[PDB]
Amino acid sequence: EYKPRLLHISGDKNAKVAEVPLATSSLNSGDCFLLDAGLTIYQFNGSKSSPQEKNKAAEVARAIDAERKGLPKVEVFCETDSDIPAEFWKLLGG
């Protein structure tokens, strides 16, 4: 059971990213987010944010891209409206 993991990419103007506990409700729409689930991963990026988390997140997905070589499945998208596909929200929130 893979341990889902909640990586967060954001910080208004002080962009800061870091590991985080599960958080569907405490998520932060607008900034870029990354949940890791065994082999699959959803960089739930938030379109309400910008190049801060976006860059930081692209950097995080990057390091993970070089670590796993894309072996695992990833889904990145800095989306906002309807930014809640039951799949990811369910995986970590449902």
Side-chain angles (χ1 to χ4, degrees):
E1 264 192 316
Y2 322 116
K3 243 170 249 204
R5 330 190 101 177
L6 278 286
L7 195 292
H8 178 196
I9 313 351
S10 89
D12 299 298
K13 260 210 251 246
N14 222 333
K16 356 183 357 180
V17 43
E19 183 188 300
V20 5
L22 107 72
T24 342
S25 31
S26 178
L27 216 98
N28 39 279
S29 177
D31 337 293
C32 275
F33 215 101
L34 148 75
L35 91 60
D36 198 332
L39 272 183
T40 308
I41 279 100
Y42 312 88
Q43 215 197 310
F44 166 48
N45 273 17
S47 231
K48 286 212 159 201
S49 77
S50 2
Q52 287 5 94
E53 46 274 301
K54 201 190 154 183
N55 205 9
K56 214 56 111 148
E59 201 207 58
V60 181
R62 240 169 156 169
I64 315 158
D65 183 31
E67 194 145 37
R68 318 243 108 162
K69 306 9 213 260
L71 189 115
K73 194 150 201 208
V74 207
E75 1 304 322
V76 292
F77 35 118
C78 233
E79 156 81 50
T80 40
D81 28 286
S82 171
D83 68 64
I84 309 97
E87 234 226 83
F88 148 36
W89 297 81
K90 186 154 158 138
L91 219 143
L92 109 69

